[PDB]
Each structure stands twice: as C-alpha cells, then as structure tokens.
Tab-separated table of C-alpha atoms in Angstrom:
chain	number	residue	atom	x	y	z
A	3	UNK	CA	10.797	-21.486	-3.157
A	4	UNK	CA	10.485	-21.281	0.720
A	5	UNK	CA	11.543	-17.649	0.481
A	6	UNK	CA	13.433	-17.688	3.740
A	7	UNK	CA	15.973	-19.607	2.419
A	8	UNK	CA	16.330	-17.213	-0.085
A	9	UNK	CA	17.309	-15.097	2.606
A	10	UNK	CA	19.344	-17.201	4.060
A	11	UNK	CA	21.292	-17.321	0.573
A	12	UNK	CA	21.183	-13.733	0.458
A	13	UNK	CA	22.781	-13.580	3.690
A	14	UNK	CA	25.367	-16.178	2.595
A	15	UNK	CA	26.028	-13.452	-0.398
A	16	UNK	CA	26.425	-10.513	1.852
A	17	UNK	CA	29.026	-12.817	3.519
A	18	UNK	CA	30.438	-13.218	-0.199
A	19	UNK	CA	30.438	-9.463	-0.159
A	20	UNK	CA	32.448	-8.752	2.855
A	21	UNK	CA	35.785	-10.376	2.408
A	22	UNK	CA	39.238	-9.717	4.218
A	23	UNK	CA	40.670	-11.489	2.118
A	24	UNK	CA	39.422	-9.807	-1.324
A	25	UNK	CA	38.298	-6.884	-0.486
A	26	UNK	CA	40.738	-6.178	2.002
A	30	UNK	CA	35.391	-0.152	7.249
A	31	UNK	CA	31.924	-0.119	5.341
A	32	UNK	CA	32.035	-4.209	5.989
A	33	UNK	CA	32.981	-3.812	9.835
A	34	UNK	CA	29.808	-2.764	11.573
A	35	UNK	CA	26.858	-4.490	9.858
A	36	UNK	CA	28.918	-7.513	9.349
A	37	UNK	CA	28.813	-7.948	13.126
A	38	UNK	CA	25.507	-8.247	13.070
A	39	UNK	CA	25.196	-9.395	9.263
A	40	UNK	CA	27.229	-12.751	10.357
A	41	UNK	CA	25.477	-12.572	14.055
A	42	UNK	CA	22.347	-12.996	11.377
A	43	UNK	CA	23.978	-16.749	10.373
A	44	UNK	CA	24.886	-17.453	13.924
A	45	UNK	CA	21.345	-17.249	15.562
A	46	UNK	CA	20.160	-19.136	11.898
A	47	UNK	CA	21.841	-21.778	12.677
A	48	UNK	CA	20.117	-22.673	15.710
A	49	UNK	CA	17.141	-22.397	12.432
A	50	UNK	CA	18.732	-23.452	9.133
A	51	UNK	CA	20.671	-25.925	10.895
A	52	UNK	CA	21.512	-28.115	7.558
A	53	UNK	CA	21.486	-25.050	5.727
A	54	UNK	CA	23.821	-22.843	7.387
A	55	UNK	CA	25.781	-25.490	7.998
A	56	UNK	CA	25.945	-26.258	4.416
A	57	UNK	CA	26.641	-22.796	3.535
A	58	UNK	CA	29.427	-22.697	5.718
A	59	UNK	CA	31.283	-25.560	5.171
A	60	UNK	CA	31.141	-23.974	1.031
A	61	UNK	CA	32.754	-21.089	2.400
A	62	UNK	CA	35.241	-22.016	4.240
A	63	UNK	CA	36.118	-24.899	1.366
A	64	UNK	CA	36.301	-21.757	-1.136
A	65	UNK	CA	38.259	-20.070	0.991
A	66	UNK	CA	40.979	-22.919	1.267
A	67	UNK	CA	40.922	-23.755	-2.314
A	68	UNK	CA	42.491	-20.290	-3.020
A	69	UNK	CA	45.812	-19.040	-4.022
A	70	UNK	CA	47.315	-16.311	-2.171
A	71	UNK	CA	50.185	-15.602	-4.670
A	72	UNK	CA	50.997	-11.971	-3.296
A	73	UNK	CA	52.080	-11.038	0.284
A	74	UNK	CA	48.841	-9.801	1.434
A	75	UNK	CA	46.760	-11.445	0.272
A	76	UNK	CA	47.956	-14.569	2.781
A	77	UNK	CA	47.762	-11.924	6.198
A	78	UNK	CA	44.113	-11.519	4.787
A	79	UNK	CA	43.197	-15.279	4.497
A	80	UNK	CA	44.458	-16.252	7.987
A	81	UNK	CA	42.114	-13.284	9.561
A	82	UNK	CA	39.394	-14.377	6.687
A	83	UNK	CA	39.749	-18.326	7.664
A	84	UNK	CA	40.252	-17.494	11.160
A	85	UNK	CA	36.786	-15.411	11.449
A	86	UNK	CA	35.054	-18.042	9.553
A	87	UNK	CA	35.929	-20.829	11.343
A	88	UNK	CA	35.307	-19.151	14.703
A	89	UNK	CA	31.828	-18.141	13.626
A	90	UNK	CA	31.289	-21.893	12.240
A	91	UNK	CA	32.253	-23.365	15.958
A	92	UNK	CA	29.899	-20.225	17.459
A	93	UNK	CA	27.192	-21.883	15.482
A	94	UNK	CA	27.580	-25.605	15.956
A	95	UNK	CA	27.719	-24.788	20.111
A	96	UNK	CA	24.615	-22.833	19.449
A	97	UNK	CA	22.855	-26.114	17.452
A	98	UNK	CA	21.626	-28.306	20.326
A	99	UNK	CA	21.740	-31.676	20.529
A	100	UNK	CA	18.514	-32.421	19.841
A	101	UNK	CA	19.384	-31.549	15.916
B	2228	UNK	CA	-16.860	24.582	-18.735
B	2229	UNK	CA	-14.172	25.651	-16.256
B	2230	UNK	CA	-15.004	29.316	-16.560
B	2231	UNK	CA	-18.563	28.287	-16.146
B	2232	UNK	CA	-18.154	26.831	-13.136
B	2233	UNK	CA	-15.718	29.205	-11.697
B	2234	UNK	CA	-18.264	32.602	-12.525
B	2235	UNK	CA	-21.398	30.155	-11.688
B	2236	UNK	CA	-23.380	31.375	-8.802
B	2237	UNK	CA	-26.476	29.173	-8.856
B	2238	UNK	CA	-26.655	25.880	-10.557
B	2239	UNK	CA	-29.390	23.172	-11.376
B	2240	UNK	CA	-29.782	19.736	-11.503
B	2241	UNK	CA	-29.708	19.166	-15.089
B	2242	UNK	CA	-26.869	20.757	-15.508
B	2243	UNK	CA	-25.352	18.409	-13.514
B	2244	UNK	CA	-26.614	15.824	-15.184
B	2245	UNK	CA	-25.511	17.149	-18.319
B	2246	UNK	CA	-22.087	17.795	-17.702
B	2247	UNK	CA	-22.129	14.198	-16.126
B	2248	UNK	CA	-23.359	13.071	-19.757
B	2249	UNK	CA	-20.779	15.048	-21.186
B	2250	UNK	CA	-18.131	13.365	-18.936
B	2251	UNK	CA	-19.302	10.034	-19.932
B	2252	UNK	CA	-19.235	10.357	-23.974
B	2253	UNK	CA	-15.500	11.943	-23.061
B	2254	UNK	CA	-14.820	8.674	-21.813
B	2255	UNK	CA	-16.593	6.294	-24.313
B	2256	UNK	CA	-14.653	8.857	-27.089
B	2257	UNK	CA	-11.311	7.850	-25.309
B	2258	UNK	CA	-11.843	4.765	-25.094
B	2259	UNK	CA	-12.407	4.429	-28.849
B	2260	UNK	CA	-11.013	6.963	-30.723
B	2261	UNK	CA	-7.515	7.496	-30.445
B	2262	UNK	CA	-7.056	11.563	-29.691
B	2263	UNK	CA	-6.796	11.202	-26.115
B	2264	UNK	CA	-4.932	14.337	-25.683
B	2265	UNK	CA	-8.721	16.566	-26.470
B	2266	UNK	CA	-10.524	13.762	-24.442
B	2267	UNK	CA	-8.838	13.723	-21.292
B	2268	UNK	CA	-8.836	17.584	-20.996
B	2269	UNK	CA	-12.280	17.624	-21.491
B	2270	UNK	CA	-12.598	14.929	-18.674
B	2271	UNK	CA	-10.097	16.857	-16.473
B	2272	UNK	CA	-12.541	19.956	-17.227
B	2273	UNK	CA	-15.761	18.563	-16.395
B	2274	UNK	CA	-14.119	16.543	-13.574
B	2275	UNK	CA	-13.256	20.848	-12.187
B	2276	UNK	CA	-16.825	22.172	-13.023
B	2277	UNK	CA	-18.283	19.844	-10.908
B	2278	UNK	CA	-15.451	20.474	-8.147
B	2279	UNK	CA	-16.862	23.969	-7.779
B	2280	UNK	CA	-20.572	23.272	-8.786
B	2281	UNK	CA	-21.350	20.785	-5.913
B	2282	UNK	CA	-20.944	23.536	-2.930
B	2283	UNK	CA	-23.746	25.138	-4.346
B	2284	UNK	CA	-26.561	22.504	-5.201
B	2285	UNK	CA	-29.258	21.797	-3.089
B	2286	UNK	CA	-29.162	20.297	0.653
B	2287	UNK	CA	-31.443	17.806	-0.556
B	2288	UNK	CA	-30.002	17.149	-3.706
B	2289	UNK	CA	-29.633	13.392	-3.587
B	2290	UNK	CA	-26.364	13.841	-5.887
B	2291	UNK	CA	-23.637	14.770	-3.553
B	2292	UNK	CA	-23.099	11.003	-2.268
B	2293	UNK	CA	-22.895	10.316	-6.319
B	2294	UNK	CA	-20.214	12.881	-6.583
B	2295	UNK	CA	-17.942	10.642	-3.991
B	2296	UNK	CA	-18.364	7.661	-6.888
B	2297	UNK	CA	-17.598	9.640	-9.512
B	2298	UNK	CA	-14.550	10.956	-7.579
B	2299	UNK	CA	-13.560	7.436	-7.627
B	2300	UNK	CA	-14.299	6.431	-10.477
B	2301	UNK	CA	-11.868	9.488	-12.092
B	2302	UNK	CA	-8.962	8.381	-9.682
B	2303	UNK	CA	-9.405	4.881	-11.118
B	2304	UNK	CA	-8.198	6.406	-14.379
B	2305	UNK	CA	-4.849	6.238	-13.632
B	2306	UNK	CA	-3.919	10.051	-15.032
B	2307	UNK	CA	-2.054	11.790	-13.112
B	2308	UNK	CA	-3.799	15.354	-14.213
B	2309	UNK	CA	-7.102	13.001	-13.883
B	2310	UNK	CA	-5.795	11.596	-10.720
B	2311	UNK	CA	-5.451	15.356	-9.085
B	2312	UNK	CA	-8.486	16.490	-9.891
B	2313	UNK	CA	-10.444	13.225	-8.579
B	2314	UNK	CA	-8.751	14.157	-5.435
B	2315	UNK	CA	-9.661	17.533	-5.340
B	2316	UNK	CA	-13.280	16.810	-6.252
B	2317	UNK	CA	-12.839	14.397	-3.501
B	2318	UNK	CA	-11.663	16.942	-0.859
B	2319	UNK	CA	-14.605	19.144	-1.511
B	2320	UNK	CA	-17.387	16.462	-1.650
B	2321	UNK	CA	-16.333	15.395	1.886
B	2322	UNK	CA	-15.591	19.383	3.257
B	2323	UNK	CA	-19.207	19.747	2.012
B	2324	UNK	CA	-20.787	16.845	2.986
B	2325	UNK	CA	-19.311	17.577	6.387
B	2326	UNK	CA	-20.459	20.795	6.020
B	2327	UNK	CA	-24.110	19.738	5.726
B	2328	UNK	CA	-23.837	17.971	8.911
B	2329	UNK	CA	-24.581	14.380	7.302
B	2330	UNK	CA	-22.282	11.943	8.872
B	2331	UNK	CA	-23.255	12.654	12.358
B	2332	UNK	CA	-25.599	9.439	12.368
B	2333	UNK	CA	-23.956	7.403	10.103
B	2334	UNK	CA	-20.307	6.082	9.222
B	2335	UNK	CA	-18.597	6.843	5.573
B	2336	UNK	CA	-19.408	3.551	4.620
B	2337	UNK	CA	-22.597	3.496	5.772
B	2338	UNK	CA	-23.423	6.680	3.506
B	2339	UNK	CA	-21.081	6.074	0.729
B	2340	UNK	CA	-22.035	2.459	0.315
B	2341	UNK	CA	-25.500	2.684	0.079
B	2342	UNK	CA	-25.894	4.868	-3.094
B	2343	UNK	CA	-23.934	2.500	-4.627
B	2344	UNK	CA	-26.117	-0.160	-3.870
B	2345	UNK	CA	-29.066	0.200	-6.305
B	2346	UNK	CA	-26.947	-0.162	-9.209
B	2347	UNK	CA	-24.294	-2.622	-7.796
B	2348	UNK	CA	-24.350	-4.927	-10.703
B	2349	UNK	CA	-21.967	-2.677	-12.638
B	2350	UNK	CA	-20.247	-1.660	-9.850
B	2351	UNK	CA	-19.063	-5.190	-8.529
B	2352	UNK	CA	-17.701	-6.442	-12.194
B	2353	UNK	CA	-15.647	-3.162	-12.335
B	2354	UNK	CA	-14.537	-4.023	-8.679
B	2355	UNK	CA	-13.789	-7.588	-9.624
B	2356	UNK	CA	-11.699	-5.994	-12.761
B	2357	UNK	CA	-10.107	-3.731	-10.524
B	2358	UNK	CA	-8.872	-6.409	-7.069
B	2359	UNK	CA	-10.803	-3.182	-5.206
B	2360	UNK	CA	-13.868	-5.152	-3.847
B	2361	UNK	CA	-15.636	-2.152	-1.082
B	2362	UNK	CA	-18.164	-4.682	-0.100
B	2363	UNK	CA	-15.016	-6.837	1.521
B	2364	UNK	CA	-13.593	-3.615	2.430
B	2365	UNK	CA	-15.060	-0.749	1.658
B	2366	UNK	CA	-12.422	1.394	4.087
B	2367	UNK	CA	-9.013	-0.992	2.662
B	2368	UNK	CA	-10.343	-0.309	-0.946
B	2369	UNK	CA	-10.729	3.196	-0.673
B	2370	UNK	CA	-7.080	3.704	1.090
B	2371	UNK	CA	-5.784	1.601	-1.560
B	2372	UNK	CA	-7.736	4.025	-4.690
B	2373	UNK	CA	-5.951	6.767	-1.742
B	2374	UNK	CA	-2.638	5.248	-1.700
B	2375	UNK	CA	-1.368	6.822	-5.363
B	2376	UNK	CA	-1.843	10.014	-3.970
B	2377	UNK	CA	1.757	9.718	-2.252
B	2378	UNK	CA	2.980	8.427	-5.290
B	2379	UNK	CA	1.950	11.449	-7.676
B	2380	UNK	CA	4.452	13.527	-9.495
B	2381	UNK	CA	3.280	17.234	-8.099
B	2382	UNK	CA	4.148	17.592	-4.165
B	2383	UNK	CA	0.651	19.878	-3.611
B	2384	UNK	CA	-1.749	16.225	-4.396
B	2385	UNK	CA	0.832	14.391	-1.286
B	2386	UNK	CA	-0.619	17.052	1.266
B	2387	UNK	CA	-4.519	17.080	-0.183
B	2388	UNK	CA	-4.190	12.906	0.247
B	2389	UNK	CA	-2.820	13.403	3.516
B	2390	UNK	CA	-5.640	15.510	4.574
B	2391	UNK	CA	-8.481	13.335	2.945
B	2392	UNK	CA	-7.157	10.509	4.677
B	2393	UNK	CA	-6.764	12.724	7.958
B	2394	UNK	CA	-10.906	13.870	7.484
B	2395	UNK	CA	-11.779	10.166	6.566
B	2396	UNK	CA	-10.003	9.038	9.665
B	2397	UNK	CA	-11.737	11.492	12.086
B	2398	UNK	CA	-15.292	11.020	10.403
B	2399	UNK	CA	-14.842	7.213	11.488
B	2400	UNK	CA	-13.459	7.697	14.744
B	2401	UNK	CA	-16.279	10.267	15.100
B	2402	UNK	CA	-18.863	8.045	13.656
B	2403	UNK	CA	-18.274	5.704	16.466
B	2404	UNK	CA	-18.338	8.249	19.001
B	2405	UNK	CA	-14.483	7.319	20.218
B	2406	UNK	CA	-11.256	8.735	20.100
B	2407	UNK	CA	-9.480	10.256	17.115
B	2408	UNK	CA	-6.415	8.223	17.563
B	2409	UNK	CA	-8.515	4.899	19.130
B	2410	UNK	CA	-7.127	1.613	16.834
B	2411	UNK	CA	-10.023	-0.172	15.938
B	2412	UNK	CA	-11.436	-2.436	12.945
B	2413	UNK	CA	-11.939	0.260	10.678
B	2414	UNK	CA	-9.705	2.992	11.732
B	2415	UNK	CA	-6.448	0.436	11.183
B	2416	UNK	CA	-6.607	1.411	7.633
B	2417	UNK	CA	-5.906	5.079	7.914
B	2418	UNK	CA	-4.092	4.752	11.057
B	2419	UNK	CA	-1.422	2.908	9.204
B	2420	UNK	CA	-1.565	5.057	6.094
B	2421	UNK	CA	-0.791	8.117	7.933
B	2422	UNK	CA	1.836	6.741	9.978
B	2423	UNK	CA	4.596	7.289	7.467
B	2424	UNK	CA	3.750	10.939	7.039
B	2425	UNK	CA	1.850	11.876	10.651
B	2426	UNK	CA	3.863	12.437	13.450
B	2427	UNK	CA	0.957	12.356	15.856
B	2428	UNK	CA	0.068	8.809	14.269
B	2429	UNK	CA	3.771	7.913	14.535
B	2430	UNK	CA	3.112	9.055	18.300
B	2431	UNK	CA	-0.026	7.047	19.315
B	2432	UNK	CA	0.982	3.666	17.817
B	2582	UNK	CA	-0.277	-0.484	20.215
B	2583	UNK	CA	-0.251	-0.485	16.848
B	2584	UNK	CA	-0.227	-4.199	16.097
B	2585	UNK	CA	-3.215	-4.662	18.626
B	2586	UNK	CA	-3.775	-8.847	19.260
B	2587	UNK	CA	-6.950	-7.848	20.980
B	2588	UNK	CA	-8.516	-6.139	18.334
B	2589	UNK	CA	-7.158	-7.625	15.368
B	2590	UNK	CA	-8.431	-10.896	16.221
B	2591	UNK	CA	-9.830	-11.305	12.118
B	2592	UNK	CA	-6.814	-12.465	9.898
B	2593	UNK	CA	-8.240	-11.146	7.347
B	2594	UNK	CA	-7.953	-7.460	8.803
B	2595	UNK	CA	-4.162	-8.385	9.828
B	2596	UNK	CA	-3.686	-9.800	6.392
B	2597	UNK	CA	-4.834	-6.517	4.895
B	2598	UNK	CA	-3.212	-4.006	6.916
B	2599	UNK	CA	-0.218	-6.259	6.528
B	2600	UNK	CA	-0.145	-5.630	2.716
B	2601	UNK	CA	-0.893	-2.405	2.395
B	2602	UNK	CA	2.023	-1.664	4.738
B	2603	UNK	CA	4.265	-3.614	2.617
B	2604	UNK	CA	2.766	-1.651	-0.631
B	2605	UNK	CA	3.415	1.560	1.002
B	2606	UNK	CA	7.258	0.638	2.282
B	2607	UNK	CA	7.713	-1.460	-1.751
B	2608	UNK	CA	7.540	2.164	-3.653
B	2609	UNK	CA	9.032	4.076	-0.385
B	2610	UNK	CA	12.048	6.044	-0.647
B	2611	UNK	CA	12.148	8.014	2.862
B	2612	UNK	CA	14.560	7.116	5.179
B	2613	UNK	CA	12.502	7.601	8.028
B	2614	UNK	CA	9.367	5.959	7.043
B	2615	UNK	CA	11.697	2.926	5.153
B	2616	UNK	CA	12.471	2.462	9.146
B	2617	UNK	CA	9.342	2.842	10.586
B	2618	UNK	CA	7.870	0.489	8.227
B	2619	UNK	CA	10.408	-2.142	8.664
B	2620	UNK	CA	9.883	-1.688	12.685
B	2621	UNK	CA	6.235	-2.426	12.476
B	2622	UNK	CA	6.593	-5.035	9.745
B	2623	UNK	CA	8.913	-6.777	12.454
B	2624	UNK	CA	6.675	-6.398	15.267
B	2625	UNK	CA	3.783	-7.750	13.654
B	2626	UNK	CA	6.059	-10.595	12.396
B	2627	UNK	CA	6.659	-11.243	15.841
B	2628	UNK	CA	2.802	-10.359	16.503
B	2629	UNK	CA	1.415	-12.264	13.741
B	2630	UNK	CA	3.640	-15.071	12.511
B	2631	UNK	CA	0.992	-16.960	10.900
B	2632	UNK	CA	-0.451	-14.422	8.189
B	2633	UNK	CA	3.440	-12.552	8.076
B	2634	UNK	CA	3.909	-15.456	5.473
B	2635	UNK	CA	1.544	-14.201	2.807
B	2636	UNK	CA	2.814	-10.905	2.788
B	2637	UNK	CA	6.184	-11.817	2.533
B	2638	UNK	CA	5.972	-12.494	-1.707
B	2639	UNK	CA	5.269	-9.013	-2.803
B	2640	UNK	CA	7.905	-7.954	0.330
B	2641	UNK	CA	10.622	-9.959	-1.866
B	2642	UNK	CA	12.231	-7.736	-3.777
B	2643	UNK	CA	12.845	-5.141	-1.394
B	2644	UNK	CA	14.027	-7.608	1.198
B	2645	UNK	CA	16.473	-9.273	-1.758
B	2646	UNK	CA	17.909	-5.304	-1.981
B	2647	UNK	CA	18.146	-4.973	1.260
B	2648	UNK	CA	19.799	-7.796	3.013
B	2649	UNK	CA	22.267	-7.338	-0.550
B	2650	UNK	CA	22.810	-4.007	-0.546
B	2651	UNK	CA	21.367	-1.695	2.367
B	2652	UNK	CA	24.044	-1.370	5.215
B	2653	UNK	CA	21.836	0.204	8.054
B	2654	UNK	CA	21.970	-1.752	11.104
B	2655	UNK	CA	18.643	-0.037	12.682
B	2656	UNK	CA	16.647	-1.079	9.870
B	2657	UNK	CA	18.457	-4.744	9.084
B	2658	UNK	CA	18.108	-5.870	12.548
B	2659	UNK	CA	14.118	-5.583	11.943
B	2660	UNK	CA	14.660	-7.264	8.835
B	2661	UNK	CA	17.234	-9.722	10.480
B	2662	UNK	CA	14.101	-10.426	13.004
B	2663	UNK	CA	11.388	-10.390	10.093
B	2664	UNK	CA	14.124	-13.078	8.238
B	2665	UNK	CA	14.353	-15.350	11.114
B	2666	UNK	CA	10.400	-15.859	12.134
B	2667	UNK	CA	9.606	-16.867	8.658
B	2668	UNK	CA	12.308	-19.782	8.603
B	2669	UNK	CA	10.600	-20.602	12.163
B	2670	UNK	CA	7.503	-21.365	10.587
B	2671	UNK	CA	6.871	-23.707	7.106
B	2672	UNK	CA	4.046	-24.729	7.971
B	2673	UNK	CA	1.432	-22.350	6.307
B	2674	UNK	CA	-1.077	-23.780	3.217
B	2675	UNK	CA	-1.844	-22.022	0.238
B	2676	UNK	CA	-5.025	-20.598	2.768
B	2677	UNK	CA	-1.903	-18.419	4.654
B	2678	UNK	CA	-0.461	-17.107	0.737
B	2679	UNK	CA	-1.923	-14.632	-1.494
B	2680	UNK	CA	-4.611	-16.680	-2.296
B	2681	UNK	CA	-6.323	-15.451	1.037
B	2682	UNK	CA	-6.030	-11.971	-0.319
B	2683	UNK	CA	-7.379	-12.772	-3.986
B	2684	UNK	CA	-10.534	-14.970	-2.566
B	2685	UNK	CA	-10.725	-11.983	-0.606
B	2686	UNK	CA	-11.127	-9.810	-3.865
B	2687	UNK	CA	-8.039	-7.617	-2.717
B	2688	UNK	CA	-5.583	-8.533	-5.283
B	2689	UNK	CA	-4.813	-5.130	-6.731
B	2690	UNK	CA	-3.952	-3.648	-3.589
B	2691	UNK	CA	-0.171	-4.972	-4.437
B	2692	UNK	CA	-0.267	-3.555	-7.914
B	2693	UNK	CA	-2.328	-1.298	-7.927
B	2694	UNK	CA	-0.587	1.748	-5.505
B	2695	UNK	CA	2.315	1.459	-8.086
B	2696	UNK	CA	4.056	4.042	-10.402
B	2697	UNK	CA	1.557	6.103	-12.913
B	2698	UNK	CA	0.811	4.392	-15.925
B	2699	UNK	CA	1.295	6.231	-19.346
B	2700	UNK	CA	-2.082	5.842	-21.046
B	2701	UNK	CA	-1.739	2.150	-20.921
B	2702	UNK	CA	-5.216	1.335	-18.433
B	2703	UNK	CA	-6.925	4.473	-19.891
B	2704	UNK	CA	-9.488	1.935	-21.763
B	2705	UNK	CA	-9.016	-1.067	-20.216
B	2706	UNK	CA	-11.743	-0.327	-17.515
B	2707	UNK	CA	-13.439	2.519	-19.524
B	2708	UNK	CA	-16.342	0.073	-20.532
B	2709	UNK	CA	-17.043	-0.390	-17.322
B	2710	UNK	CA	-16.591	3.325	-16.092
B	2711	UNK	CA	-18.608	4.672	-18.823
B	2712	UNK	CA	-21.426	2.297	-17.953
B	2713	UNK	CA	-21.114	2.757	-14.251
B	2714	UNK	CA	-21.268	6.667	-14.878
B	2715	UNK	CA	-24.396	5.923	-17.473
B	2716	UNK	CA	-26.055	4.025	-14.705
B	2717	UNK	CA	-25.847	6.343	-12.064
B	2718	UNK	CA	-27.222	8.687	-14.018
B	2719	UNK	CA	-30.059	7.004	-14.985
B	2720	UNK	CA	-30.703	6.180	-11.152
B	2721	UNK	CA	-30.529	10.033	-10.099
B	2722	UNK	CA	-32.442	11.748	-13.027
C-alpha cells in the first residue's frame, strides 16, 4: 500500500495525538520535531500532506468550543496549524 | 546416557553411531507418537552424551564435522531445552575443532560445507522447508539458526550465543588471514549480530561499507537480519543503535531499504504512534522520508529478492519459541537427514 504513506498517515495520527486544544509537556518536545517530520514531507508528499492538512485544520474549525478553555486552546491549536501549513507550502517549490 | 557420558573416559565409534541411532528413532517416535514429554528428554540426553563424548574421539575421526550438522539440526527443533543443548554441543564441537588445529587452512564454510555435501539431497529439501538455504549463504543461514539464541528464556544460552558467534567471527577473519574486526563479505554477518551486544563491535563500525557491499544481495541480507534482530528487541540501547544503522544504510542503500521495510512495519507503525524518543525518531523520521523519495522499486527490490534467494525464514524464523507446534513438521526430514549421515560415516 506504498507503505510510506502509511507513515505519513501515522504521522498525521501522532498530530491527532498531540492536541492543545483536547488534550490541553509529553507532546512539547517530539512534536517539534514530530510536525518538523510533515514540514520537510511536504517538500515529498506534496498532495498528501497537503491533503492531510487542509483535513486538519477543517476538523479543527468545524468544532465547538462550548467551555472557556477550550476556545484559548483552539486559537493556539489553529494558530500552530496554520503556521506550520504556510511553513510547508513556502517549502513546496514551484516546480510542484 | 548422561551419566555415561559424564564418567566415560574412552569412547568408540560405534557408540557414537549408536547413540546417533538412538537419537534418530527419538525423533521418528516424536514425530509419531504423541508422548513427547519421554521423547524429547531422551533427545535432550543423547544430544549431552555426545556434548561430552566428542572431546575424546579420535583426531582422525571423520565425525566431528558431522557433530556441527547434528548441532544444527537439534537447534532447528525449536525446544528451548533442545535449543540449549544444540548450542552447547555447538560450543564444544567448535572449542574442539579449534583445538585440533583444523581451520588453519580452510574457512568454516569451507569445512562445514563439505561434509554436507555427499548427502545434499536431503539436506537442500529440509533447507528449502526451512527459508535457511547455506549454499546461498551458508554464514547468513547459520546466524539466522544463531539468532534464537538471544531470544531464549534462560540468560546463561544469551552469553554461550554471544561467544559462538564471537569464535565463528574470529575463525573467518582468521581464515582470511585479516583483521578480527576487518568488514568484509562474510564477516558482515557476525559483525552485525554482535553489534547489539559487543561493545568493541559497537566501537569498530564503516559499518554500511559501499565499497565492499557492492552485491545487493549481501546488503539485502544484512539489511533483514538487522531488522529481525531490532523486530523482537526490547533494549533501549540496541533499539537505538539499530534504528541508527537502519537509517544510515537507508541513506546508504536506498534502493534495497525498500524490501526490508515490510517486515520493519509493525515496529515502525508503534513507533512513529507511540514511542516519544527524539534520538531514535529522528532516524526513523530519516528512514520515513527516503522511502517516500523513492517509488520506483519492482517486485525484484521486495521480498521476492529474498525468497528467490531461499532466505525467507530469516524474518520468521528468529521469532518467539514455539510450544511443540514445529516439533514434527520438519522431523521427516531431520530424521532422514540424521539416518543419512549415518549411513555416510559408518
């Protein structure tokens, strides 16, 4: 099944893992490098990534956010998402 | 029999031959009957008496390379009682055989491989039942039959494998007339199995040589049996180590990295899920990103290259011990090997 996008989708689950917004420092240290993993795919997985990306960040605003929190989480969660989406489209050349 | 040979002083060749015969109607009885738990003892005990018989046959008795074949043929068994005493059987055939100064001319495979010869035919359809094939290679299947040792329940048959493999490594270095610790065609094998546990081989290892390693075949092999040794792997350290040379040859070898990457699967899948070690993911991380660089490679570059190469067990076959399952699968073929080498050598 073209494992390494199996890995890719693994790494798009370890992004479902880590979540400011739901879970709320064990996701602070390898998820600098686990979403500096999708950053230097996307130069890669181009459709992919980008693809996976653009489902996260639609998940994240289709959401709720009833409580107090839970809002302060989503801007940091959104905010982190879409800074690591523009880190990866200036890392896509042109030539994609 | 074990009292035998422990208070024997002096020994003769039929009785090797007879406690030989003895081992193989053990077998056959095993195989066929169903109280395995008098059969196996008696295998494990005749498997001992010969353990302490051999230092004490003749120098030209032409049955201490058989004894290495029989060794072998116990640790393909599966039993992990079996199992230890194929590897201490092993330990002394080789400290005597060493002993009797008769690998200074010649390599292990060069001696081992030629008894073997005369009555191949059995020998090559229990090979081809096995995925073990010696005559592809004879030094990758017998670190492969070597590999379980690590995996064994009882601590003392880790350190006995770790020496055989240490004495096989220097008799082939030796054999050569090079270094101990020189990488080379043959001595990639046991250089990589005693990486994990060495710390001199973890010292002098470069490892991946491009020079040397020129055959993909030899790449493809030492490339699975590291993966089999990290798949069962539970140390810390050697779970790195692994994953660091795994990388590097990734970067080394992108071509053949994607065969080895299907049995690599599940431990990547836990992992990149669960493991939260930045040393050892940023290997990984490396590993991840080479194989989406390539999709390009044919069924030729899967583990179809392995399995034409009759090596198809080395992925299966360094697993967990068995419970009595395998006993008499390959029996047939054991007893008959055992049957034929007899007949050959008296």
């Amino acid at each position: 099944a073209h494992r390494p996008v199996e890995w890719v989708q693994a790494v798009v689950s370890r992004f479902d893992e880590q979540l400011p917004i739901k879970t709320g420092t064990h996701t602070k240290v390898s998820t600098e490098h686990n979403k500096e993993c999708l950053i230097n795919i996307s130069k890669y997985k181009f459709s992919l990534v980008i693809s996976g990306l653009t489902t996260i960040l639609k998940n994240v605003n289709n959401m709720r956010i009833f409580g107090e929190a839970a809002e302060k989480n989503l801007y940091l969660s959104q905010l982190i998402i879409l800074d690591t989406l523009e880190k990866c489209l200036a890392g896509q050349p042109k030539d994609t």
